Each structure stands twice: as structure tokens, then as C-alpha cells.
Amino acid sequence: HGYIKEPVSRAYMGALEKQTMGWTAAAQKYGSVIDNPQSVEGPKGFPAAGPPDGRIASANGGSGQIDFGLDKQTADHWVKQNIRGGFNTFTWHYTAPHATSKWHYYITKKNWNPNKPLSRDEFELIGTVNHDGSKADTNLTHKIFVPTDRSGYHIILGVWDVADTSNAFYNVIDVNLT
Ligand SMILES: [Cu+]
């Protein structure tokens, strides 16, 4: 269990807005993840397996831990944060830093549609971080190259695969590129 804390994942942004907008208004926007941003947990094996299209952002309800609120997708729904193309760091906060096989990061394609449910074929792999099966917190922060050939609203997906179970954690990040 854990989430991407910098940049702010959509799930963590939910937890943050619980504090500013209050429980009901935040949950109306994000669903029940606001209480448990660390629990966006689904099957591993992405992209050939894993959570189905339209259920990527919620990891198909976090294996029962959250609802499907994160799966909403419009151009205007989510809070974007600015990020510059090029090398960036992605830091996870772990409530339970399980043994880890890898992390893998994807970005939306130049021509993606921000008003449709997220699908695999809208993402491209941008970096993979191999791990030796030790705990996740032996490598908290990853340096990933974000493509420099696209701008505006994009989604970075980070995926954390657990070494010793069939699970992974899926955190989408809403960004305004350059
Ligand atoms: Cu966990």
C-alpha cells in the first residue's frame, strides 16, 4: 500500500482535497479513495493483463477497497499540476512497503482523448525501474524521462508491482506539460 506523493497522484490529490473541501464535497469529486489514497490496488501484469480499460485509474475499485470514482474522465474534472518535459522524479509514500519486482511508468499519447475512459492503447511506456525483490522503500524515488514532444493535459500512470503477490498499485497523475 502506497501512493505517489510527488508529483501528486490523483488519489493523493483526493486526500488533500478532503482537507480543503471537506469529506462530502471531496468524495463527490473523487469517491471513497479520499480516505485511503494508498489503496488503488489491482491485479499485476499491466499492460497485457491488470485492470481492464475504463477501470485503470481506480484499479477496478482497488480490489474492493475503494469505489469507481477515479475512473471518471473529462478534460475539466481533475486538478492538473505543472510539470516540465524531461527528467522528473516520482516519489512514493508507503503505508506498507511490500517486496517489489518493478515499477513502470506510462504517459498518454500526443493525440489522446481526455473526454473518454482511459484505455491501454492511449498510453505509452516511458520507463521501467527493475527491483531485486527487496522492500519498496529501498528505492523511494525514481528518475523518469517524460517525453518532450507533447504539451497540455496529459496523464502519467505509475505502476508498482508487488513481488510476492498477484497485485500492483496504479496511480494516475494529471499534469499540464510545459
Ligand atoms: Cu499493501
JSON list of C-alpha atoms and ligand atoms in Angstrom, two decimals:
[
{"chain": "A", "resi": 1, "resn": "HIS", "atom": "CA", "xyz": [0.00, 0.00, 0.00]},
{"chain": "A", "resi": 2, "resn": "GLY", "atom": "CA", "xyz": [1.28, 3.35, -1.07]},
{"chain": "A", "resi": 3, "resn": "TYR", "atom": "CA", "xyz": [0.87, 6.24, -3.45]},
{"chain": "A", "resi": 4, "resn": "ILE", "atom": "CA", "xyz": [2.85, 8.73, -5.50]},
{"chain": "A", "resi": 5, "resn": "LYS", "atom": "CA", "xyz": [3.30, 11.83, -3.32]},
{"chain": "A", "resi": 6, "resn": "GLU", "atom": "CA", "xyz": [5.50, 13.96, -5.65]},
{"chain": "A", "resi": 7, "resn": "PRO", "atom": "CA", "xyz": [4.14, 14.72, -8.21]},
{"chain": "A", "resi": 8, "resn": "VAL", "atom": "CA", "xyz": [0.70, 14.47, -6.54]},
{"chain": "A", "resi": 9, "resn": "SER", "atom": "CA", "xyz": [-1.21, 11.46, -7.78]},
{"chain": "A", "resi": 10, "resn": "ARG", "atom": "CA", "xyz": [-4.87, 11.85, -8.35]},
{"chain": "A", "resi": 11, "resn": "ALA", "atom": "CA", "xyz": [-5.56, 9.60, -5.39]},
{"chain": "A", "resi": 12, "resn": "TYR", "atom": "CA", "xyz": [-3.40, 11.68, -3.08]},
{"chain": "A", "resi": 13, "resn": "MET", "atom": "CA", "xyz": [-4.97, 14.88, -4.53]},
{"chain": "A", "resi": 14, "resn": "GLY", "atom": "CA", "xyz": [-8.29, 13.37, -3.28]},
{"chain": "A", "resi": 15, "resn": "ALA", "atom": "CA", "xyz": [-6.89, 13.05, 0.26]},
{"chain": "A", "resi": 16, "resn": "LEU", "atom": "CA", "xyz": [-5.61, 16.61, 0.02]},
{"chain": "A", "resi": 17, "resn": "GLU", "atom": "CA", "xyz": [-8.96, 17.99, -1.13]},
{"chain": "A", "resi": 18, "resn": "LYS", "atom": "CA", "xyz": [-10.75, 16.16, 1.70]},
{"chain": "A", "resi": 19, "resn": "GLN", "atom": "CA", "xyz": [-8.85, 18.62, 3.92]},
{"chain": "A", "resi": 20, "resn": "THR", "atom": "CA", "xyz": [-9.70, 21.76, 1.89]},
{"chain": "A", "resi": 21, "resn": "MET", "atom": "CA", "xyz": [-13.21, 20.96, 0.55]},
{"chain": "A", "resi": 22, "resn": "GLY", "atom": "CA", "xyz": [-14.40, 18.55, 3.30]},
{"chain": "A", "resi": 23, "resn": "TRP", "atom": "CA", "xyz": [-15.41, 14.95, 3.23]},
{"chain": "A", "resi": 24, "resn": "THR", "atom": "CA", "xyz": [-18.69, 15.14, 1.22]},
{"chain": "A", "resi": 25, "resn": "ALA", "atom": "CA", "xyz": [-17.53, 17.61, -1.48]},
{"chain": "A", "resi": 26, "resn": "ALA", "atom": "CA", "xyz": [-14.20, 15.76, -1.92]},
{"chain": "A", "resi": 27, "resn": "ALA", "atom": "CA", "xyz": [-15.92, 12.37, -2.13]},
{"chain": "A", "resi": 28, "resn": "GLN", "atom": "CA", "xyz": [-18.39, 13.73, -4.68]},
{"chain": "A", "resi": 29, "resn": "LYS", "atom": "CA", "xyz": [-15.39, 14.58, -6.89]},
{"chain": "A", "resi": 30, "resn": "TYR", "atom": "CA", "xyz": [-13.09, 11.57, -6.23]},
{"chain": "A", "resi": 31, "resn": "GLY", "atom": "CA", "xyz": [-15.17, 8.88, -4.48]},
{"chain": "A", "resi": 32, "resn": "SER", "atom": "CA", "xyz": [-14.10, 6.93, -1.43]},
{"chain": "A", "resi": 33, "resn": "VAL", "atom": "CA", "xyz": [-10.38, 6.96, -2.21]},
{"chain": "A", "resi": 34, "resn": "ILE", "atom": "CA", "xyz": [-10.15, 10.24, -0.30]},
{"chain": "A", "resi": 35, "resn": "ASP", "atom": "CA", "xyz": [-9.81, 8.20, 2.92]},
{"chain": "A", "resi": 36, "resn": "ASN", "atom": "CA", "xyz": [-7.36, 5.64, 1.55]},
{"chain": "A", "resi": 37, "resn": "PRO", "atom": "CA", "xyz": [-5.18, 7.04, -1.24]},
{"chain": "A", "resi": 38, "resn": "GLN", "atom": "CA", "xyz": [-2.73, 4.15, -0.60]},
{"chain": "A", "resi": 39, "resn": "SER", "atom": "CA", "xyz": [-5.25, 1.52, -1.71]},
{"chain": "A", "resi": 40, "resn": "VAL", "atom": "CA", "xyz": [-5.50, 1.79, -5.54]},
{"chain": "A", "resi": 41, "resn": "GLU", "atom": "CA", "xyz": [-4.69, -1.92, -5.80]},
{"chain": "A", "resi": 42, "resn": "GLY", "atom": "CA", "xyz": [-5.46, -4.27, -8.68]},
{"chain": "A", "resi": 43, "resn": "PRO", "atom": "CA", "xyz": [-4.04, -7.28, -10.46]},
{"chain": "A", "resi": 44, "resn": "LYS", "atom": "CA", "xyz": [-0.45, -7.03, -11.75]},
{"chain": "A", "resi": 45, "resn": "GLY", "atom": "CA", "xyz": [0.64, -7.80, -15.32]},
{"chain": "A", "resi": 46, "resn": "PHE", "atom": "CA", "xyz": [-0.12, -4.44, -16.91]},
{"chain": "A", "resi": 47, "resn": "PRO", "atom": "CA", "xyz": [-0.46, -3.81, -19.82]},
{"chain": "A", "resi": 48, "resn": "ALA", "atom": "CA", "xyz": [-1.17, -7.37, -21.17]},
{"chain": "A", "resi": 49, "resn": "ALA", "atom": "CA", "xyz": [-3.18, -8.05, -18.01]},
{"chain": "A", "resi": 50, "resn": "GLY", "atom": "CA", "xyz": [-4.21, -5.99, -14.99]},
{"chain": "A", "resi": 51, "resn": "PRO", "atom": "CA", "xyz": [-7.30, -3.78, -14.51]},
{"chain": "A", "resi": 52, "resn": "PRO", "atom": "CA", "xyz": [-9.50, -3.52, -17.62]},
{"chain": "A", "resi": 53, "resn": "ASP", "atom": "CA", "xyz": [-9.87, -0.48, -19.84]},
{"chain": "A", "resi": 54, "resn": "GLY", "atom": "CA", "xyz": [-12.08, 2.17, -18.18]},
{"chain": "A", "resi": 55, "resn": "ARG", "atom": "CA", "xyz": [-11.01, 0.79, -14.75]},
{"chain": "A", "resi": 56, "resn": "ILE", "atom": "CA", "xyz": [-7.32, 1.71, -14.81]},
{"chain": "A", "resi": 57, "resn": "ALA", "atom": "CA", "xyz": [-7.47, 4.82, -12.64]},
{"chain": "A", "resi": 58, "resn": "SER", "atom": "CA", "xyz": [-9.45, 3.02, -9.87]},
{"chain": "A", "resi": 59, "resn": "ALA", "atom": "CA", "xyz": [-7.57, -0.27, -10.36]},
{"chain": "A", "resi": 60, "resn": "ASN", "atom": "CA", "xyz": [-11.05, -1.78, -10.76]},
{"chain": "A", "resi": 61, "resn": "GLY", "atom": "CA", "xyz": [-12.22, -0.40, -7.39]},
{"chain": "A", "resi": 62, "resn": "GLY", "atom": "CA", "xyz": [-8.99, -1.16, -5.63]},
{"chain": "A", "resi": 63, "resn": "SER", "atom": "CA", "xyz": [-9.86, -4.85, -5.23]},
{"chain": "A", "resi": 64, "resn": "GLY", "atom": "CA", "xyz": [-12.86, -3.86, -3.13]},
{"chain": "A", "resi": 65, "resn": "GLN", "atom": "CA", "xyz": [-11.07, -1.13, -1.10]},
{"chain": "A", "resi": 66, "resn": "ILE", "atom": "CA", "xyz": [-12.44, 1.92, -2.92]},
{"chain": "A", "resi": 67, "resn": "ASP", "atom": "CA", "xyz": [-15.22, 2.69, -5.44]},
{"chain": "A", "resi": 68, "resn": "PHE", "atom": "CA", "xyz": [-15.01, 3.63, -9.16]},
{"chain": "A", "resi": 69, "resn": "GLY", "atom": "CA", "xyz": [-14.80, 7.43, -8.66]},
{"chain": "A", "resi": 70, "resn": "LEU", "atom": "CA", "xyz": [-11.30, 7.76, -10.10]},
{"chain": "A", "resi": 71, "resn": "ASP", "atom": "CA", "xyz": [-12.49, 6.35, -13.42]},
{"chain": "A", "resi": 72, "resn": "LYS", "atom": "CA", "xyz": [-14.40, 9.47, -14.40]},
{"chain": "A", "resi": 73, "resn": "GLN", "atom": "CA", "xyz": [-12.60, 11.22, -17.23]},
{"chain": "A", "resi": 74, "resn": "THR", "atom": "CA", "xyz": [-13.21, 14.63, -18.73]},
{"chain": "A", "resi": 75, "resn": "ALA", "atom": "CA", "xyz": [-10.99, 17.45, -19.83]},
{"chain": "A", "resi": 76, "resn": "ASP", "atom": "CA", "xyz": [-12.02, 19.55, -16.81]},
{"chain": "A", "resi": 77, "resn": "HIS", "atom": "CA", "xyz": [-12.72, 17.07, -13.99]},
{"chain": "A", "resi": 78, "resn": "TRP", "atom": "CA", "xyz": [-9.31, 16.70, -12.37]},
{"chain": "A", "resi": 79, "resn": "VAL", "atom": "CA", "xyz": [-6.76, 19.09, -10.86]},
{"chain": "A", "resi": 80, "resn": "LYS", "atom": "CA", "xyz": [-3.69, 19.41, -13.09]},
{"chain": "A", "resi": 81, "resn": "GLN", "atom": "CA", "xyz": [-0.23, 20.26, -11.85]},
{"chain": "A", "resi": 82, "resn": "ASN", "atom": "CA", "xyz": [2.50, 21.73, -13.98]},
{"chain": "A", "resi": 83, "resn": "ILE", "atom": "CA", "xyz": [5.36, 19.55, -14.97]},
{"chain": "A", "resi": 84, "resn": "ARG", "atom": "CA", "xyz": [8.22, 20.25, -17.37]},
{"chain": "A", "resi": 85, "resn": "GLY", "atom": "CA", "xyz": [9.19, 17.71, -20.07]},
{"chain": "A", "resi": 86, "resn": "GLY", "atom": "CA", "xyz": [12.43, 15.84, -19.49]},
{"chain": "A", "resi": 87, "resn": "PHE", "atom": "CA", "xyz": [13.78, 14.17, -16.41]},
{"chain": "A", "resi": 88, "resn": "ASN", "atom": "CA", "xyz": [11.46, 14.27, -13.42]},
{"chain": "A", "resi": 89, "resn": "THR", "atom": "CA", "xyz": [11.35, 12.47, -10.13]},
{"chain": "A", "resi": 90, "resn": "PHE", "atom": "CA", "xyz": [8.46, 10.33, -8.86]},
{"chain": "A", "resi": 91, "resn": "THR", "atom": "CA", "xyz": [8.42, 9.69, -5.11]},
{"chain": "A", "resi": 92, "resn": "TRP", "atom": "CA", "xyz": [6.17, 7.10, -3.48]},
{"chain": "A", "resi": 93, "resn": "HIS", "atom": "CA", "xyz": [4.90, 7.25, 0.10]},
{"chain": "A", "resi": 94, "resn": "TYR", "atom": "CA", "xyz": [4.32, 3.74, 1.51]},
{"chain": "A", "resi": 95, "resn": "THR", "atom": "CA", "xyz": [1.99, 2.77, 4.35]},
{"chain": "A", "resi": 96, "resn": "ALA", "atom": "CA", "xyz": [3.14, -0.83, 3.76]},
{"chain": "A", "resi": 97, "resn": "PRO", "atom": "CA", "xyz": [6.34, -1.11, 1.62]},
{"chain": "A", "resi": 98, "resn": "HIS", "atom": "CA", "xyz": [5.99, -4.62, 0.23]},
{"chain": "A", "resi": 99, "resn": "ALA", "atom": "CA", "xyz": [8.64, -6.66, -1.54]},
{"chain": "A", "resi": 100, "resn": "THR", "atom": "CA", "xyz": [8.85, -5.22, -5.05]},
{"chain": "A", "resi": 101, "resn": "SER", "atom": "CA", "xyz": [9.56, -6.64, -8.50]},
{"chain": "A", "resi": 102, "resn": "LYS", "atom": "CA", "xyz": [9.36, -3.41, -10.55]},
{"chain": "A", "resi": 103, "resn": "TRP", "atom": "CA", "xyz": [7.82, -0.06, -11.13]},
{"chain": "A", "resi": 104, "resn": "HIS", "atom": "CA", "xyz": [6.72, 1.08, -14.58]},
{"chain": "A", "resi": 105, "resn": "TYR", "atom": "CA", "xyz": [5.59, 4.46, -15.91]},
{"chain": "A", "resi": 106, "resn": "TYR", "atom": "CA", "xyz": [3.45, 5.40, -18.89]},
{"chain": "A", "resi": 107, "resn": "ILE", "atom": "CA", "xyz": [2.23, 8.70, -20.37]},
{"chain": "A", "resi": 108, "resn": "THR", "atom": "CA", "xyz": [-0.75, 9.45, -22.56]},
{"chain": "A", "resi": 109, "resn": "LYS", "atom": "CA", "xyz": [-0.08, 9.72, -26.28]},
{"chain": "A", "resi": 110, "resn": "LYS", "atom": "CA", "xyz": [0.09, 13.04, -28.11]},
{"chain": "A", "resi": 111, "resn": "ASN", "atom": "CA", "xyz": [-3.36, 12.56, -29.60]},
{"chain": "A", "resi": 112, "resn": "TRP", "atom": "CA", "xyz": [-5.18, 11.04, -26.59]},
{"chain": "A", "resi": 113, "resn": "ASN", "atom": "CA", "xyz": [-8.81, 11.90, -25.83]},
{"chain": "A", "resi": 114, "resn": "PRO", "atom": "CA", "xyz": [-9.24, 13.47, -22.39]},
{"chain": "A", "resi": 115, "resn": "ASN", "atom": "CA", "xyz": [-13.03, 13.02, -22.53]},
{"chain": "A", "resi": 116, "resn": "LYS", "atom": "CA", "xyz": [-13.10, 9.23, -22.83]},
{"chain": "A", "resi": 117, "resn": "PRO", "atom": "CA", "xyz": [-12.42, 6.49, -20.31]},
{"chain": "A", "resi": 118, "resn": "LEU", "atom": "CA", "xyz": [-8.73, 5.61, -20.01]},
{"chain": "A", "resi": 119, "resn": "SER", "atom": "CA", "xyz": [-7.59, 2.68, -22.13]},
{"chain": "A", "resi": 120, "resn": "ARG", "atom": "CA", "xyz": [-4.19, 0.95, -22.57]},
{"chain": "A", "resi": 121, "resn": "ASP", "atom": "CA", "xyz": [-3.87, 1.99, -26.12]},
{"chain": "A", "resi": 122, "resn": "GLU", "atom": "CA", "xyz": [-3.82, 5.67, -25.10]},
{"chain": "A", "resi": 123, "resn": "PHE", "atom": "CA", "xyz": [-0.59, 5.14, -23.02]},
{"chain": "A", "resi": 124, "resn": "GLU", "atom": "CA", "xyz": [2.99, 4.55, -23.92]},
{"chain": "A", "resi": 125, "resn": "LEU", "atom": "CA", "xyz": [5.72, 3.20, -21.72]},
{"chain": "A", "resi": 126, "resn": "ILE", "atom": "CA", "xyz": [8.29, 5.81, -20.73]},
{"chain": "A", "resi": 127, "resn": "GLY", "atom": "CA", "xyz": [10.37, 4.00, -18.14]},
{"chain": "A", "resi": 128, "resn": "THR", "atom": "CA", "xyz": [10.77, 0.80, -16.15]},
{"chain": "A", "resi": 129, "resn": "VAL", "atom": "CA", "xyz": [12.56, 0.54, -12.77]},
{"chain": "A", "resi": 130, "resn": "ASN", "atom": "CA", "xyz": [13.74, -3.04, -12.02]},
{"chain": "A", "resi": 131, "resn": "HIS", "atom": "CA", "xyz": [13.90, -4.09, -8.43]},
{"chain": "A", "resi": 132, "resn": "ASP", "atom": "CA", "xyz": [15.60, -7.05, -6.77]},
{"chain": "A", "resi": 133, "resn": "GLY", "atom": "CA", "xyz": [12.59, -8.19, -4.65]},
{"chain": "A", "resi": 134, "resn": "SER", "atom": "CA", "xyz": [13.60, -6.22, -1.59]},
{"chain": "A", "resi": 135, "resn": "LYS", "atom": "CA", "xyz": [11.12, -3.85, 0.08]},
{"chain": "A", "resi": 136, "resn": "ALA", "atom": "CA", "xyz": [9.75, -0.89, -1.92]},
{"chain": "A", "resi": 137, "resn": "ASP", "atom": "CA", "xyz": [11.33, 1.69, 0.33]},
{"chain": "A", "resi": 138, "resn": "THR", "atom": "CA", "xyz": [14.84, 0.65, -0.64]},
{"chain": "A", "resi": 139, "resn": "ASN", "atom": "CA", "xyz": [14.10, 2.79, -3.78]},
{"chain": "A", "resi": 140, "resn": "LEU", "atom": "CA", "xyz": [11.59, 5.56, -2.86]},
{"chain": "A", "resi": 141, "resn": "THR", "atom": "CA", "xyz": [12.16, 7.94, -5.79]},
{"chain": "A", "resi": 142, "resn": "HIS", "atom": "CA", "xyz": [12.52, 7.17, -9.49]},
{"chain": "A", "resi": 143, "resn": "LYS", "atom": "CA", "xyz": [14.02, 9.32, -12.28]},
{"chain": "A", "resi": 144, "resn": "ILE", "atom": "CA", "xyz": [11.89, 9.00, -15.34]},
{"chain": "A", "resi": 145, "resn": "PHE", "atom": "CA", "xyz": [12.18, 10.85, -18.63]},
{"chain": "A", "resi": 146, "resn": "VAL", "atom": "CA", "xyz": [8.85, 12.44, -19.52]},
{"chain": "A", "resi": 147, "resn": "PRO", "atom": "CA", "xyz": [8.59, 12.91, -23.35]},
{"chain": "A", "resi": 148, "resn": "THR", "atom": "CA", "xyz": [9.35, 16.44, -24.63]},
{"chain": "A", "resi": 149, "resn": "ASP", "atom": "CA", "xyz": [7.23, 16.10, -27.87]},
{"chain": "A", "resi": 150, "resn": "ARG", "atom": "CA", "xyz": [3.87, 16.89, -26.27]},
{"chain": "A", "resi": 151, "resn": "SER", "atom": "CA", "xyz": [2.14, 19.58, -24.19]},
{"chain": "A", "resi": 152, "resn": "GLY", "atom": "CA", "xyz": [-1.06, 20.42, -22.37]},
{"chain": "A", "resi": 153, "resn": "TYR", "atom": "CA", "xyz": [-3.13, 17.99, -20.39]},
{"chain": "A", "resi": 154, "resn": "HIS", "atom": "CA", "xyz": [-1.52, 14.54, -20.08]},
{"chain": "A", "resi": 155, "resn": "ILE", "atom": "CA", "xyz": [-1.78, 11.66, -17.58]},
{"chain": "A", "resi": 156, "resn": "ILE", "atom": "CA", "xyz": [1.23, 9.91, -16.19]},
{"chain": "A", "resi": 157, "resn": "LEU", "atom": "CA", "xyz": [0.44, 6.43, -14.94]},
{"chain": "A", "resi": 158, "resn": "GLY", "atom": "CA", "xyz": [2.73, 4.91, -12.36]},
{"chain": "A", "resi": 159, "resn": "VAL", "atom": "CA", "xyz": [2.50, 1.22, -11.63]},
{"chain": "A", "resi": 160, "resn": "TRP", "atom": "CA", "xyz": [4.06, -0.56, -8.64]},
{"chain": "A", "resi": 161, "resn": "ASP", "atom": "CA", "xyz": [4.24, -4.39, -8.93]},
{"chain": "A", "resi": 162, "resn": "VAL", "atom": "CA", "xyz": [4.41, -6.42, -5.68]},
{"chain": "A", "resi": 163, "resn": "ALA", "atom": "CA", "xyz": [6.95, -9.25, -5.95]},
{"chain": "A", "resi": 164, "resn": "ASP", "atom": "CA", "xyz": [5.21, -11.90, -3.80]},
{"chain": "A", "resi": 165, "resn": "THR", "atom": "CA", "xyz": [1.53, -11.46, -4.67]},
{"chain": "A", "resi": 166, "resn": "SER", "atom": "CA", "xyz": [-0.58, -11.09, -7.81]},
{"chain": "A", "resi": 167, "resn": "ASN", "atom": "CA", "xyz": [-1.20, -7.39, -7.03]},
{"chain": "A", "resi": 168, "resn": "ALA", "atom": "CA", "xyz": [0.00, -3.98, -8.22]},
{"chain": "A", "resi": 169, "resn": "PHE", "atom": "CA", "xyz": [-0.83, -0.37, -7.35]},
{"chain": "A", "resi": 170, "resn": "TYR", "atom": "CA", "xyz": [-1.97, 2.01, -10.09]},
{"chain": "A", "resi": 171, "resn": "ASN", "atom": "CA", "xyz": [-1.61, 5.76, -9.66]},
{"chain": "A", "resi": 172, "resn": "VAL", "atom": "CA", "xyz": [-2.61, 8.19, -12.34]},
{"chain": "A", "resi": 173, "resn": "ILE", "atom": "CA", "xyz": [-1.21, 11.70, -12.25]},
{"chain": "A", "resi": 174, "resn": "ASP", "atom": "CA", "xyz": [-2.91, 14.65, -14.03]},
{"chain": "A", "resi": 175, "resn": "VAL", "atom": "CA", "xyz": [-0.35, 17.03, -15.49]},
{"chain": "A", "resi": 176, "resn": "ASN", "atom": "CA", "xyz": [-0.09, 20.12, -17.57]},
{"chain": "A", "resi": 177, "resn": "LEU", "atom": "CA", "xyz": [3.00, 19.54, -19.65]},
{"chain": "A", "resi": 178, "resn": "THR", "atom": "CA", "xyz": [5.28, 22.57, -20.00]},
{"chain": "B", "resi": 1, "resn": "CU", "atom": "CU", "xyz": [-0.12, -3.08, 0.70]}
]
